[PDB]
Amino acid sequence: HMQLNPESADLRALAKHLYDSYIKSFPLTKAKARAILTGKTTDKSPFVIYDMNSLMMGEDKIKFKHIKEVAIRIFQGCQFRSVEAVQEITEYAKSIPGFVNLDLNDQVTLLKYGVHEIIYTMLASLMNKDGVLISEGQGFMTREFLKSLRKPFGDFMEPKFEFAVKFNALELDDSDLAIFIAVIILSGDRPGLLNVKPIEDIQDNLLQALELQLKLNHPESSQLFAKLLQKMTDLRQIVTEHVQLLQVIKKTESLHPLLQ
């Protein structure tokens, strides 16, 4: 029996706080990404990379923030973007009420073990069955062009596509995702945390906010909350596999000037 009471109002104020902070830290929102992907925007139409010739023409026309072999140049761009995302995700984490009042080593631990799960959650916003938006919406790289890259690069992004097509069928919006990502950041089961209880306390309040958001926002999906927790479980798997591919590449094949 749901009521609009001081408790529910506080959970709506938390959801709004997170949404505002989310779209501040990540201004290519799902709403804007979907508008670009469905051609329902007045913004510039992305340049499509669908084969080796369009990639060569794209390196020019698409204007990347970054500055011999195609697959390695693409992987290096991917690496650069993930470094910028770690800073964006940290800036979002600092907005979650309670997070900066945690032990600094636990703040670092939650972000260290959380950022990949959050990257692949947010990447789904940018993906459809054809491909992925790159360079903040200026480019679109096809899923089959990425699969055509030589081993081991060909198989790098395909598991993220697989996750995204099922994740996107849940039809979450930015208001849902902002809370979902906060829930993933405040995971009390990360290795090497010093003080778990205060993390579980924040996560409990975020779970209450997520449950209410999904009830208000998704009238025809009664178990969406459960389906989202099932996805948080599945992201753990995606990231385990991802760190394995990253090792193969490191042992078998220059980085962001922020590291230098």
């Binding site: 800073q87 940290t90 703040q107 670092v108 972000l111 260290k112 950022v115 980085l255 922020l258 590291l259």
Partner: peptide, 11 residues
């Protein structure tokens, strides 16, 4: 290098 970027971004 992940932790370095995080500590950098936190402080």
């Amino acid at each position: 290098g992940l932790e370095a970027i995080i500590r950098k971004a936190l402080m």
